[PDB]
């Protein structure tokens with residue numbers, strides 16, 4: 001029994017919610033709040049533990065960018081602090097390779113990071129690796145065939161259609177084919193042999209378009225668009241289908257969750273979050289307790 005966990009997010013202020021959705025029965029489960037509210041974080045799972053990485057606490061009494069790594073154990077329904085990153089990273093992207101967590105990009109105040117660092121759970125240590133060729137915040141990140149991809153974002157001046165790939169054994173980043181669309185704050189994930197980029201902000205509008213990169217052919221192709229335009233959406237894959245959660249459509253903070261079936265190239269509404277929000281962290285692991 002595997003669940004889609006959504007951590008944090010933003011509506012009026014940064015949120016502390018941890019809620020888990022069960023696609024087998026449509027149920028939502030409210031779980032232990034984050035110790036610190038945060039939006040613009042990323043979520044990921046290593047060894048059945050859920051991790052919340054980076055973000056920012058937008059609060060009535062201040063805005064604090066987060067370098068925090070916090071671990072959630074579903075067996076205990078408890079959050080524990082882990083080692084903090086070298087720098088705060090708001091609107092971060094993360095990916096997991098070989099049990100290690102890679103933190104990519106993000107902002108610290110007006111600083112837009114190209115820097116990248118790697119967490120080793122068995123030592124509770126972060127270490128910096130080679131930086132990206134481009135500064136990227138609102139960057140989408142995914143892992144395919146043990147290579148790490150950084151897609152889109154904002155470099156401080158322009159929103160980006162560019163993307164690049166990290167080769168761990170060479171500690172080296174290389175540009176890949178750019179997307180067909182400029183996207184900041186897109187949902188980026190992997191399904192089969194393709195990197196998907198859904199939604200985001202192109203500098204003028206929130207997008208509903210979706211495109212995917214075939215690593216073998218090195219081309220981006222559009223698929224069916226989402227039913228809702230959305231930036232700052234959460235995304236994950238669960239049993240061969242993409243789920244997108246919430247985001248901002250220029251008018252509302254969405255509670256809509258949509259599901260993409262790649263066999264039929266269609267999106268359907270599958271549930272609503274308990275409240276509209278953007279900038280969530282999302283990951284999949286076992287059900288709690």
Ligand SMILES: CN(C)C(=O)c1cccc2c1-c1ccccc1C2=O
Nearest residue numbers: 138184185200201206231232248278
């Ligand atoms: C920058 N960008 C990726 C946006 O989508 C965006 C653009 C203009 C205004 C806003 C946003 C945005 C994104 C998420 C939460 C709130 C906002 C806003 O007020």
